[PDB]
Every structure is written in structure tokens, then in C-alpha cells.
Amino acid sequence: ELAQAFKEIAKAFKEIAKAFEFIAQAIEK
Amino acid sequence: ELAQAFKEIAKAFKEIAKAFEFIAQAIEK
Amino acid sequence: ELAQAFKEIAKAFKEIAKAFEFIAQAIEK
Amino acid sequence: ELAQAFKEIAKAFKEIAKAFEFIAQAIEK
Amino acid sequence: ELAQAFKEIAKAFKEIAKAFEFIAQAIEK
Amino acid sequence: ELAQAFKEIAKAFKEIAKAFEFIAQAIEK
Ligand SMILES: [Cl-]
Ligand SMILES: [Cl-]
């Protein structure tokens, strides 16, 4: 029960990291 | 371009909040 | 003990989501 | 406008860090 | 200036994702 | 095992808070 929840959390933070990379790329461009 | 990225980020943090509420409920139970 | 801490964490991430929505709205405007 | 929003975000993440330290201390104890 | 900061942020969230995966693995085990 | 992981997480969120303060300062300037 707890394991999957923390896995869903790790996945959400990876999507967040992706979004901030995107943002970084939009600024440079 | 930037607006939607930050919106996608706000959505990810809301899913994260949901997950930690879930976790909180799993502990109590 | 642990439950409330994770609840305080879920609340903080919801405030964070709100802030990024705000930011998104400030960019568009 | 944007500056204060990111400041409110930095403050929220510091409260989050505090909460996870708390959690870490509750586990050890 | 801003680009690198958001890149440093994306990197921090990836380390966070790693940590929660670790945690998930510690629970199962 | 779990304690140190959550400590590493609290440290990552403090670095994140620092980065958003930086960003806030870059906007004002
Ligand atoms: Cl736990
Ligand atoms: Cl910006």
C-alpha cells in the first residue's frame, strides 16, 4: 500500500523535473 | 509557452499532495 | 505522529500548486 | 509580482524540508 | 541566469524522485 | 534506512528553496 504511493510520488517529481527542464529551455530560447 | 508549463507543474504538485494524504490515511489505518 | 506530518506536507504542496497557478496567471497577463 | 510568488514558494519548500526532518526524527525514535 | 537555476531545480527534483523510489524499495523489503 | 532517506529528501527541498530565492532575486534585479 505505502510502497506504490511513494512510487506514484517519485513519478510525479520526475514529471516535475521534466517541466522545469522545459522551462529552462524556453528561457534560453 | 511558459504559462502551460507552470500549470502542468501546479497539477503535478496537486497529485503529490493527494498521494501524501493517501499515505497519511494508510498510516492511521 | 507520522500521519499529521504527512498531512502538513500535503497541505504545503497544495499551497505550492496554488503559487504556480498564480505565476502561470501572471505570465499570461 | 513574480518575485513574491517564488518567495512564497521557497518558504513552502522550507516548511516541507522541516516536515521531512520531523518524520526522519519520528522514525529513529 | 534563470535557465541554470531552473536546471538546478530540475536536478534536485530528480534526486528527490530517486529518494522516494529508495523509500518505496525499503518498505517492500 | 528510512530515516536517512527522508533526511536526504529534506536536504534536497532546502536546496530547492534556495534556488527559488535565487530566482526571486534575479527577477527583481
Ligand atoms: Cl513510513
Ligand atoms: Cl519566469
Side-chain angles (χ1 to χ4, degrees), chain C residues 1-20:
Chain C
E1 227 146 314
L2 286 174
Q4 82 188 340
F6 286 114
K7 291 176 182 177
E8 296 174 359
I9 291 167
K11 176 64 197 306
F13 282 117
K14 282 195 290 295
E15 304 174 68
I16 285 166
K18 267 163 53 181
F20 281 113

Side-chain angles (χ1 to χ4, degrees), chain A:
Chain A
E1 227 146 314
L2 286 174
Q4 82 188 340
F6 286 114
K7 291 176 182 177
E8 296 174 359
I9 291 167
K11 176 64 197 306
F13 282 117
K14 282 195 290 295
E15 304 174 68
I16 285 166
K18 267 163 53 181
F20 281 113
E21 292 179 358
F22 187 79
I23 290 169
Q25 295 178 41
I27 301 299
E28 300 184 15
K29 283 174 145 65

Side-chain angles (χ1 to χ4, degrees), chain A residues 12-13 16-17 20, chain B residues 6-20, chain C residues 9-18 20, chain D residues 9 13 16, chain E residues 9 13 16, chain F residues 13 16 20:
Chain A
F13 282 117
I16 285 166
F20 281 113
Chain B
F6 286 114
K7 291 176 182 177
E8 296 174 359
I9 291 167
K11 176 64 197 306
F13 282 117
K14 282 195 290 295
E15 304 174 68
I16 285 166
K18 267 163 53 181
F20 281 113
Chain C
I9 291 167
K11 176 64 197 306
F13 282 117
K14 282 195 290 295
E15 304 174 68
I16 285 166
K18 267 163 53 181
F20 281 113
Chain D
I9 291 167
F13 282 117
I16 285 166
Chain E
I9 291 167
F13 282 117
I16 285 166
Chain F
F13 282 117
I16 285 166
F20 281 113

Side-chain angles (χ1 to χ4, degrees), chain A residues 27, chain B residues 2 6, chain C residues 27, chain D residues 2 6, chain E residues 2 6, chain F residues 27:
Chain A
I27 301 299
Chain B
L2 286 174
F6 286 114
Chain C
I27 301 299
Chain D
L2 286 174
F6 286 114
Chain E
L2 286 174
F6 286 114
Chain F
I27 301 299

Side-chain angles (χ1 to χ4, degrees), chain E residues 5-20:
Chain E
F6 286 114
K7 291 176 182 177
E8 296 174 359
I9 291 167
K11 176 64 197 306
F13 282 117
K14 282 195 290 295
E15 304 174 68
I16 285 166
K18 267 163 53 181
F20 281 113

Side-chain angles (χ1 to χ4, degrees), chain A residues 2 6, chain B residues 27, chain C residues 2 6, chain D residues 27, chain E residues 27, chain F residues 2 6:
Chain A
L2 286 174
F6 286 114
Chain B
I27 301 299
Chain C
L2 286 174
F6 286 114
Chain D
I27 301 299
Chain E
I27 301 299
Chain F
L2 286 174
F6 286 114

